[PDB]
Every structure is written in structure tokens, then in C-alpha cells.
Amino acid sequence: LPPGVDALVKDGEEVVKGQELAPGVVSRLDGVALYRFPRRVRVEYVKKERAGLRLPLAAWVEKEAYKPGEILAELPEPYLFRAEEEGVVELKELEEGAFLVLRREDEPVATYFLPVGMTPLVVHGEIVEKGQPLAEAKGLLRMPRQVRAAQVEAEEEGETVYLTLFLEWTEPKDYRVQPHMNVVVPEGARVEAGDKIVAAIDPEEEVIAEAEGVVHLHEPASILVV
Amino acid sequence: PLLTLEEEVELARKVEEGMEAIKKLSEITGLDPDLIREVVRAKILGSARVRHIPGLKETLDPKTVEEIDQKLKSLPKEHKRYLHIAREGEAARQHLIEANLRLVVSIAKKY
RNA sequence: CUCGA
DNA sequence: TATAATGGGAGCTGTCACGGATGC
DNA sequence: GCATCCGTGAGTCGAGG
């Protein structure tokens, strides 16, 4: 496989004769494809948090949980989601959607969740007071494809509802593997804190899993069909 | 075919760890590292090549290698692991030599 | 290789 | 015993009759 | 059933070097 070019097929999967293995490789035979020296190891770390979100009561759609991509509400007019705490802003943008954290001193004082269709009006490190707009939700707003809502708690107050969402998702981290290193973990395996992913000649260059997550192998040096 | 840097390093690593594994198996079993090495090598190569090794105190025949292989296979999982390590070690050894047969020619043509 | 019979 | 080294290199050919696998 | 490639014989003794 050419440099920086990823595989179209996955490790361990059956192959048919003539079936392309990659944009520049056609397998002459049928069998099991195997990864030869994955140069990039992507780890999807599992994160389970609890975040909040205030919405107009009319726009909201009542559900006990929310699947990815599923509509969370529909606004007739632009709505301003406001801070209910004072503090400094830690803006953590995902692929789509974001987690906005408010903290005073070291301690986090608030954690809001911005679904898709909700443009954040603050930058990282910004100081906010209560009632200050943190994000503008325009039109329809939905769950991002990468995050799912396990449980939903709703608190009716005035003409608004406050949602405590028990969210679960994954965050990717890439690791560039060097030729003198060897991956000691298979595809789709679950790792914890302290577990080694890629070994090396010297201990300081090893790849140890920070938190809990799953392992994905990309960009193999070559592919061995057997 | 000629090895890439990665393939080369991989094979060398497998060989080294394989030898270390034979050492560990000698520690556990209380057997002779040489005998164990010869049994592993015998299984990797096959029934075609089973001859008596000069240093071995015991004549290496399929019977004895089967007895020793059964003494090895009868180990706990974490102990039986080193056996697999050793086997893959020998395999890597064969492949490493065979991959590096050209260099020998390129040198020998000058003598 | 060359010479001899 | 540790930079890396990875497929050789000879090669003029002016006879003849048979048994042979062969192999056209 | 008939051309083609291969292996094998091809005088004696004697002398020199």
C-alpha cells in the first residue's frame, strides 16, 4: 500500500477474487485479508457524562431517550440558550455538536450540551455571567451522529423545560506507529487505563491507553490475503 | 522476496522473544533448553526432518519428541503461551534466513 | 606435443 | 561480533557412424 | 513410420622433453 493511503477493506474480513482491497490493489485470490504493519492506530475512548440544556416547552419533543441523528426540538424562531451559572468557558467541540463547560476556579460549575443546529456564541476561555447567551439554536436541532442520549430528565419551569441528558459517546485519538514499533492489540479490542497498545524499543515511546476505549487500525504498510 | 525494514524487525523480534520463551520453558519444565529447542524445531519443520542431534543426551526420535510435546501441551495457559512464542520464533528464524540468502551470494562471488 | 619404424 | 551492503559469468569449434531415447 | 541430439570410438611400438 502506497504511503498515507488507507485500506477499503477491514482486518480479518473475507475477500473475493478480483475484489479491490484498496484504490490501487486488486486481490488475485479469495480468502482472509490481514493487516501488515498499521502505521496509524486510532483509539475511540468511551466517555459517559451528564449535561444540561434549556429549551422552550413548545419546541421540545418529549422522549425518554434520544438516538443519534434524532430530532430533539424544532424552533419557530431563533432561540438564545443562556448561561445559568457564572464562570470561565471550556468549549469542547466534537465532530458535530459540542460540550460547553463552565467553571469557577478549578471546579466545574456547569456542563451544557449543544446539539446540531446550535451555533456557540462563545470561544474557549471566555468569562460569562448569568443570563448571557452561550449559543444560538436556529430552526430544527438534532442529536449529533457520534453521540447518543441514554437517559433524559425533564424539569418544567415557567415556559421552558430543562433537560438533564445522560450522554454517552466516543472521542478519537490517533497514534503514528514507527517501523521499529509493534501493535500488541487486535482490531476492535477494548483497552483500559495502563494497557499497552503499541510496543517499542524504548519504554518512553510506547503507546499506553490513557482511558477506556476501543482500538482501530488504519493505514497498513501492506495487506496479506491468505 | 526481499524483506522490508518492518518485516525484518518483526522477524528478528520474534526470533529473540522465541529464544527467551525457550529459556522460560526450560525454567518451568526443568527440561533441557536444547531438547526443547529441538522439539519445537522438529514440529515446525515436520516429520521429514527428525534426526539425532550430537549434543543431545537423548536420541531425537518422533516418540521422544511426542512425549516432550505432550509434556509441553499439558501446561497451564500462561505457561503454555511460551510454547506458541517459541514455535513462531523458529518459523521467523527460517523465514529470516531464507529471506537473506541473496546477501550470501553477493558476498561469496568475491571469493 | 615433436621425431622414428 | 553491529553504518549498509541482498540473483554468477563463462562461452573459437573444420569428423563420423551408431544406438537411443524421441519427438517430430 | 521418419529426421533429431547424444555418446563413442578412431594402429603400434619406440625416442625427446
Side-chain angles (χ1 to χ4, degrees), chain B:
Chain B
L2 281 178
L3 299 177
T4 318
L5 178 59
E6 295 156 326
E7 301 172 319
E8 178 179 321
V9 173
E10 187 188 18
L11 294 169
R13 175 174 58 77
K14 297 194 196 307
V15 174
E16 198 156 290
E17 289 168 332
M19 294 189 60
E20 294 170 347
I22 300 183
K23 289 298 179 185
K24 233 65 177 63
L25 286 181
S26 177
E27 297 177 7
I28 305 172
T29 326
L31 255 49
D32 193 44
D34 311 88
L35 176 58
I36 299 176
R37 188 191 67 249
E38 292 304 318
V39 169
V40 173
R41 188 176 291 158
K43 286 301 179 182
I44 295 299
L45 296 176
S47 57
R49 205 189 309 181
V50 184
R51 215 193 81 201
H52 174 49
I53 313 299
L56 270 56
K57 302 177 299 180
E58 316 161 16
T59 58
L60 204 66
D61 55 335
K63 163 177 296 175
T64 291
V65 318
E66 194 70 12
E67 297 179 17
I68 301 301
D69 205 34
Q70 290 305 320
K71 234 140 93 70
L72 285 170
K73 287 178 181 298
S74 58
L75 291 192
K77 182 190 176 186
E78 75 282 7
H79 280 2
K80 194 181 182 180
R81 171 181 178 83
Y82 294 122
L83 183 56
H84 304 75
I85 310 292
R87 296 281 194 96
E88 190 161 14
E90 291 292 335
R93 172 175 180 257
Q94 308 293 316
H95 191 18
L96 186 56
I97 306 169
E98 276 186 322
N100 285 286
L101 287 182
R102 295 165 191 241
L103 184 65
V104 175
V105 165
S106 65
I107 296 176
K109 68 178 178 182
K110 300 176 298 175
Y111 293 83

Side-chain angles (χ1 to χ4, degrees), chain A residues 4 19 79-80 86-87 89 115 139 141-142 162 168 198 204 219 222:
Chain A
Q19 173 188 20
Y79 172 73
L80 296 176
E86 304 117 341
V89 164
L141 50 91
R142 299 180 286 192
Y162 187 79
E168 295 173 336
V198 186
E204 73 279 4
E219 301 184 34
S222 56

